[PDB]
Amino acid sequence: SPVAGQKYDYILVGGGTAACVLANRLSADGSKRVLVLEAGPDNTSRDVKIPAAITRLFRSPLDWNLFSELQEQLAERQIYMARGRLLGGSSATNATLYHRGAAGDYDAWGVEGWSSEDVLSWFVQAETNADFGPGAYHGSGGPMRVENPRYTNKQLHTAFFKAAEEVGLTPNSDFNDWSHDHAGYGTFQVMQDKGTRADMYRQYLKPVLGRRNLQVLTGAAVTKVNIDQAAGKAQALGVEFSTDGPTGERLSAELAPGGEVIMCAGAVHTPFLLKHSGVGPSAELKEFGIPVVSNLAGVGQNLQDQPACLTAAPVKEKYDGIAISDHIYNEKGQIRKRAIASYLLGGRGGLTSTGCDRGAFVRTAGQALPDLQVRFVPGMALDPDGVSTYVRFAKFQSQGLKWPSGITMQLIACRPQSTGSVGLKSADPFAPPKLSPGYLTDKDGADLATLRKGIHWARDVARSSALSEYLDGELFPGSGVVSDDQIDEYIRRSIHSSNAITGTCKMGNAGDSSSVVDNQLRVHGVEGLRVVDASVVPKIPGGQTGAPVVMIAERAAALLTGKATIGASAAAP
Ligand SMILES: Cc1cc2nc3c(=O)[nH]c(=O)nc-3n(C[C@H](O)[C@H](O)[C@H](O)COP(=O)(O)OP(=O)(O)OC[C@H]3O[C@@H](n4cnc5c(N)ncnc54)[C@H](O)[C@@H]3O)c2cc1C
Ligand SMILES: CCCCCCCCCCCCCCCCCC(=O)O
Ligand SMILES: CCCCCCCCCCCCCCCCC
């Protein structure tokens, strides 16, 4: 109806992080008709713009409200896995931390044309940094805004840094500088523009919405890719969607000749939509009567997510009032005047903060790269599940109660060995996917050992004189949790997502039978169909996954518009 009579050079499934970048670069020269289909609404919420409002976005109408299958290995629990549902996608709901990981993460992919040397210029092209000038590892004119966080806890941030030095960890002045080792303590940069969320809707899509060759539909739920098995190969025709929920008319958007469908529905929904389109393991598609168009074992396999647990500790009575919770709320749960004024006057203070933007990468046992990320928060968790405690914090407003002053250290397995999957529970494309994070399932128990040693690392730091000054005991996991078996059980009962999720449409070399896309991001066995989102990441880098997604989308845009090739090798003689 809004597409009837139209032919598109690109149809982007989803309007999230990658889709905003592609919509921008693919529509730039004016010759190509680009359509964006996003299930969620327009990006207008004040809770998106204010970083501390991340607390309100969890479990909100701007989230998918996805829950895993029951996890036997995690005390028989379903795990909440937050996912953005609006233009900008998860970039509009994330903790804004800016991480590329280490050079070793990209070289470990072992995919021709996607080495660390290959991807570095695509990170740099995307970047404008308020705190790092141009050089080997930083750019200065790209659409992303990156900056040092504009909130500092004067007592607790320096106490965390002094405590990390007292236990012998070295500082890392730039977690994105590949000329030195990834390990150390320091400050995480953030995807913010003077304390306002700089999501990819704001940085890439919103500025170009006036382009006549660019059509963006919201409230548009894609139900499948339309694929024709005519000539002698499967050919994408376009995509089916509803603008009116499960009961809506199935509309079809149509490709112009030479048109491509680009999957941008992210590491949960892209493999889900591919399976609904006939692209996936034939046995899974046959289960729900889906005709097999491309029998691809890898679709929805290799789900990688970075699992988290935490410690938390109150400050002494004499240090009541010094936590970020005291800077945001007064003793009655009223938003502080000073915080509102500092945010609105010059984009500073507690409302600029996502909480978890100082920390460390740590090797728990002589690994080639750090297995542990630490996120220090100068406020005290009231739940061992950090995401639950952020939801509690949002609901705390105006309750007339005092949030107790303290600290938290979240421990993340940042290069996990466990994998999970995404598949189908039902034939209905409006139904939640069958979601299995796979936390703590690796054969050697490596991921559990990382989180157990992380808790020992956080306890060592909290015991150090620098942080001991402020603290008065431990709330989580608490004095009942001491032996390795007690810690392991605390972890199983409290483990939560640090909200990565990659690898479900794994990019791979020729000869890699687990791959879903080639090094050109084309889906095996279909013409005019690509995946450009976190799905394609072969092996998850250390640290949060947003910046790698934007890099992949920048490089894919350059490839599709003929400004770059991928691979590399001279022809053999
Ligand atoms: C709570 C949270 C915290 C995070 N913290 C950080 C962090 O601090 N730093 C960071 O770098 N990364 C962070 N991440 C991860 C990062 O945000 C993601 O890896 C990245 O945004 C993924 O980009 P994407 O384009 O692959 O998918 P997304 O941005 O998730 O976009 C996919 C889009 O597809 C849409 N879609 C789904 N199904 C359909 C359908 N049927 N029809 C149409 N559209 C559909 C979705 O609604 C969504 O808008 C966080 C993630 C979350 C959720
Ligand atoms: C943890 C609780 C998060 C609280 C966040 C909401 C705080 C709102 C303060 C009052 C509104 C501030 C003025 C509106 C600013 C709009 C956002 C922006 O345009 O950058
Ligand atoms: C955005 C600032 C909110 C202040 C929160 C005060 C409590 C601190 C809790 C930290 C929770 C564990 C680690 C972070 C979880 C990230 C979702």
Coordinates of C-alpha atoms in Angstrom, one line a residue, residues 167-462:
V167 CA 46.2 -5.6 43.2
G168 CA 48.8 -5.1 40.4
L169 CA 46.6 -4.5 37.2
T170 CA 48.2 -2.0 34.8
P171 CA 46.3 0.9 33.3
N172 CA 45.0 0.8 29.7
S173 CA 44.8 4.5 28.5
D174 CA 42.8 3.5 25.3
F175 CA 41.0 0.1 25.1
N176 CA 40.7 0.7 21.2
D177 CA 44.5 1.3 20.7
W178 CA 45.8 -2.0 19.1
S179 CA 49.5 -0.9 19.6
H180 CA 49.2 -2.2 23.2
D181 CA 47.7 -5.2 25.0
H182 CA 43.9 -5.2 25.6
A183 CA 44.3 -5.9 29.4
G184 CA 44.2 -3.2 32.1
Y185 CA 41.9 -0.8 34.0
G186 CA 40.5 2.5 32.8
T187 CA 37.6 4.4 31.4
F188 CA 35.3 3.2 28.7
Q189 CA 34.5 5.8 26.1
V190 CA 30.8 6.2 25.3
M191 CA 28.7 6.8 22.1
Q192 CA 27.4 10.1 23.4
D193 CA 27.4 13.7 22.1
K194 CA 28.0 16.0 25.1
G195 CA 26.0 13.6 27.4
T196 CA 23.1 12.8 25.0
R197 CA 22.7 9.3 23.5
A198 CA 24.4 9.2 20.0
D199 CA 22.6 6.2 18.6
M200 CA 22.8 5.3 14.9
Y201 CA 19.3 6.7 14.2
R202 CA 20.5 10.1 15.5
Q203 CA 24.0 9.9 13.8
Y204 CA 23.2 8.2 10.4
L205 CA 19.5 8.0 9.6
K206 CA 17.8 11.1 11.0
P207 CA 20.0 13.6 9.1
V208 CA 19.2 12.0 5.7
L209 CA 15.4 11.4 6.1
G210 CA 14.7 14.3 3.5
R211 CA 16.3 12.3 0.6
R212 CA 13.6 11.4 -2.0
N213 CA 15.3 8.0 -2.8
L214 CA 14.9 6.9 0.9
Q215 CA 11.6 5.5 2.3
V216 CA 11.5 4.5 6.0
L217 CA 8.4 2.6 7.4
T218 CA 7.9 2.0 11.1
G219 CA 5.2 -0.4 12.5
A220 CA 6.3 -2.6 9.6
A221 CA 6.8 -6.2 10.7
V222 CA 8.7 -8.3 8.0
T223 CA 7.2 -11.8 7.9
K224 CA 9.6 -13.3 5.3
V225 CA 11.9 -12.6 2.3
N226 CA 10.1 -13.4 -1.0
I227 CA 12.4 -15.8 -2.9
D228 CA 11.7 -17.2 -6.5
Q229 CA 13.2 -20.7 -7.4
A230 CA 12.7 -20.0 -11.2
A231 CA 15.7 -19.9 -13.7
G232 CA 18.2 -22.3 -12.0
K233 CA 18.9 -20.6 -8.6
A234 CA 16.9 -19.1 -5.7
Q235 CA 16.5 -15.3 -6.3
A236 CA 15.2 -12.7 -3.7
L237 CA 12.2 -10.9 -5.2
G238 CA 11.6 -8.6 -2.1
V239 CA 9.9 -8.9 1.3
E240 CA 6.5 -9.5 2.8
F241 CA 5.4 -7.4 5.8
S242 CA 2.3 -6.2 7.8
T243 CA 1.8 -2.6 8.9
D244 CA -1.0 -3.8 11.2
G245 CA 0.3 -6.6 13.4
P246 CA -0.6 -10.3 13.1
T247 CA -4.0 -9.6 11.5
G248 CA -2.7 -7.1 8.9
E249 CA -2.7 -7.7 5.1
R250 CA 0.6 -9.3 4.0
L251 CA 2.0 -6.5 1.8
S252 CA 5.0 -7.2 -0.6
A253 CA 7.7 -4.7 -1.4
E254 CA 9.4 -5.5 -4.7
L255 CA 13.0 -5.3 -5.9
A256 CA 14.0 -3.5 -9.2
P257 CA 16.2 -5.6 -11.5
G258 CA 19.6 -6.1 -9.8
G259 CA 17.9 -5.2 -6.4
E260 CA 19.1 -6.8 -3.1
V261 CA 17.4 -7.6 0.2
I262 CA 19.8 -6.8 3.1
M263 CA 19.0 -8.5 6.4
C264 CA 19.4 -6.0 9.3
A265 CA 17.1 -7.5 12.0
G266 CA 20.1 -8.4 14.2
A267 CA 21.5 -11.6 15.7
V268 CA 18.1 -12.7 17.2
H269 CA 15.6 -11.8 14.4
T270 CA 17.7 -12.2 11.2
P271 CA 18.2 -16.0 11.5
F272 CA 14.6 -16.2 12.7
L273 CA 13.3 -14.4 9.5
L274 CA 15.7 -16.4 7.2
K275 CA 14.3 -19.7 8.7
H276 CA 10.7 -18.3 8.0
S277 CA 11.9 -17.6 4.4
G278 CA 13.2 -21.2 3.8
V279 CA 16.9 -20.4 4.5
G280 CA 18.1 -22.7 7.3
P281 CA 18.5 -26.3 8.5
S282 CA 16.0 -28.3 6.4
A283 CA 14.8 -30.3 9.5
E284 CA 13.9 -27.1 11.5
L285 CA 12.0 -25.7 8.4
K286 CA 10.2 -29.0 7.8
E287 CA 9.1 -29.1 11.5
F288 CA 6.8 -26.1 10.7
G289 CA 6.0 -26.9 7.0
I290 CA 8.4 -24.2 5.7
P291 CA 9.6 -25.1 2.1
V292 CA 13.4 -25.4 2.0
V293 CA 14.9 -22.9 -0.4
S294 CA 18.6 -23.1 0.9
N295 CA 19.4 -25.9 3.3
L296 CA 22.0 -24.0 5.5
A297 CA 23.1 -25.8 8.7
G298 CA 24.6 -22.6 10.2
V299 CA 21.5 -20.4 10.4
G300 CA 20.7 -19.6 14.1
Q301 CA 23.8 -21.6 15.3
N302 CA 27.0 -20.1 16.9
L303 CA 24.9 -17.6 19.0
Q304 CA 27.6 -15.9 21.2
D305 CA 26.6 -13.7 24.2
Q306 CA 28.7 -12.4 27.0
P307 CA 27.2 -13.6 30.4
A308 CA 27.5 -11.5 33.6
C309 CA 27.4 -11.8 37.4
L310 CA 28.1 -9.1 40.0
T311 CA 29.4 -8.3 43.5
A312 CA 28.1 -5.3 45.4
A313 CA 29.0 -3.6 48.7
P314 CA 27.7 -0.7 50.8
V315 CA 29.8 2.3 51.8
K316 CA 30.4 3.2 55.5
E317 CA 27.7 5.4 57.1
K318 CA 30.1 8.5 56.9
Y319 CA 30.1 8.1 53.1
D320 CA 26.3 8.0 52.7
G321 CA 25.4 10.3 49.8
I322 CA 28.5 9.8 47.6
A323 CA 27.1 7.2 45.1
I324 CA 25.6 7.8 41.6
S325 CA 22.2 6.7 43.1
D326 CA 22.5 9.8 45.4
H327 CA 23.4 12.1 42.5
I328 CA 20.3 11.0 40.5
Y329 CA 17.7 10.6 43.3
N330 CA 17.2 12.3 46.7
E331 CA 16.1 10.2 49.8
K332 CA 12.5 10.2 48.6
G333 CA 13.2 9.0 45.0
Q334 CA 12.8 12.4 43.5
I335 CA 15.1 13.2 40.5
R336 CA 17.7 15.7 41.8
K337 CA 17.5 19.3 40.6
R338 CA 21.3 19.5 40.4
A339 CA 21.3 16.4 38.0
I340 CA 18.6 17.9 35.7
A341 CA 20.3 21.3 35.7
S342 CA 23.8 19.8 35.0
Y343 CA 22.3 17.7 32.1
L344 CA 20.3 20.6 30.5
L345 CA 23.0 23.4 31.1
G346 CA 26.1 21.6 29.6
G347 CA 25.4 17.8 29.3
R348 CA 27.2 16.8 32.5
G349 CA 26.3 14.9 35.8
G350 CA 24.6 11.7 36.7
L351 CA 21.9 11.7 33.9
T352 CA 24.8 11.4 31.3
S353 CA 25.8 8.1 32.9
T354 CA 24.8 4.5 32.0
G355 CA 26.6 3.4 35.2
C356 CA 29.0 0.7 33.9
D357 CA 31.5 2.9 31.9
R358 CA 34.7 2.3 34.1
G359 CA 36.3 -1.1 34.5
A360 CA 39.0 -3.5 33.2
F361 CA 39.9 -6.4 31.0
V362 CA 41.6 -9.2 32.9
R363 CA 43.3 -12.5 32.0
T364 CA 42.0 -14.9 34.8
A365 CA 44.6 -17.6 33.8
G366 CA 47.3 -16.9 31.2
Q367 CA 44.9 -16.7 28.1
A368 CA 46.2 -15.2 24.9
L369 CA 43.5 -12.4 25.3
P370 CA 41.5 -11.3 28.4
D371 CA 38.6 -13.6 29.2
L372 CA 37.1 -11.2 31.9
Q373 CA 35.7 -7.7 31.5
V374 CA 34.9 -5.8 34.7
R375 CA 32.4 -2.9 34.8
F376 CA 32.6 -0.8 38.0
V377 CA 29.5 1.1 38.9
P378 CA 29.6 3.8 41.7
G379 CA 26.2 2.6 42.9
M380 CA 25.0 -0.5 44.8
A381 CA 23.0 -3.3 43.1
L382 CA 20.0 -4.4 45.2
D383 CA 19.6 -7.6 43.1
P384 CA 22.3 -10.1 42.0
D385 CA 20.8 -9.7 38.5
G386 CA 22.2 -6.3 37.2
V387 CA 19.5 -5.8 34.6
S388 CA 16.7 -6.5 37.2
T389 CA 18.4 -3.9 39.5
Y390 CA 18.3 -1.3 36.6
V391 CA 14.5 -2.0 36.2
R392 CA 14.1 -1.7 40.0
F393 CA 16.1 1.7 39.9
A394 CA 13.7 3.1 37.2
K395 CA 10.6 1.9 39.2
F396 CA 12.2 3.4 42.4
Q397 CA 11.3 7.0 41.3
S398 CA 8.8 8.9 43.6
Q399 CA 8.5 5.8 46.0
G400 CA 9.6 8.0 49.0
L401 CA 12.5 5.5 49.7
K402 CA 16.3 5.9 50.0
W403 CA 18.5 3.7 47.7
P404 CA 21.5 2.7 49.9
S405 CA 24.9 4.2 48.9
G406 CA 27.4 1.6 47.6
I407 CA 29.3 0.1 44.6
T408 CA 28.9 -2.8 42.2
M409 CA 31.4 -4.7 40.1
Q410 CA 29.9 -6.6 37.2
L411 CA 32.0 -9.5 35.9
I412 CA 31.6 -10.5 32.2
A413 CA 33.0 -13.5 30.2
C414 CA 33.9 -11.2 27.3
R415 CA 35.4 -13.9 25.0
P416 CA 33.2 -16.9 25.9
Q417 CA 33.6 -20.5 24.7
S418 CA 29.8 -21.3 25.1
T419 CA 27.4 -21.1 22.1
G420 CA 23.6 -21.1 21.9
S421 CA 21.0 -20.9 19.1
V422 CA 17.9 -19.1 17.8
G423 CA 15.2 -21.1 16.0
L424 CA 11.4 -21.5 15.7
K425 CA 8.8 -22.4 18.4
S426 CA 5.9 -22.1 15.9
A427 CA 5.0 -21.4 12.2
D428 CA 3.8 -17.9 13.2
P429 CA 6.4 -15.2 12.1
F430 CA 4.9 -12.8 14.8
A431 CA 5.8 -15.3 17.6
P432 CA 8.9 -14.9 19.8
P433 CA 11.9 -16.9 18.5
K434 CA 13.1 -20.0 20.3
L435 CA 16.1 -18.4 22.0
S436 CA 18.9 -20.3 23.8
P437 CA 21.8 -18.3 25.1
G438 CA 23.9 -21.4 25.9
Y439 CA 25.5 -19.7 28.9
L440 CA 28.0 -22.0 30.8
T441 CA 27.6 -25.0 28.4
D442 CA 31.2 -25.1 27.1
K443 CA 32.7 -28.6 27.5
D444 CA 35.7 -27.5 29.8
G445 CA 33.6 -25.2 32.1
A446 CA 35.8 -22.2 31.0
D447 CA 33.0 -19.6 31.1
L448 CA 31.9 -20.6 34.6
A449 CA 35.7 -20.6 35.7
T450 CA 36.0 -17.0 34.2
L451 CA 33.0 -15.7 36.3
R452 CA 34.1 -17.6 39.5
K453 CA 37.7 -16.0 39.2
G454 CA 36.0 -12.7 38.4
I455 CA 34.2 -12.8 41.7
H456 CA 37.6 -13.6 43.4
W457 CA 39.1 -10.6 41.4
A458 CA 36.3 -8.2 42.5
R459 CA 36.6 -9.3 46.2
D460 CA 40.5 -8.7 46.0
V461 CA 39.8 -5.1 44.6
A462 CA 37.1 -4.4 47.2

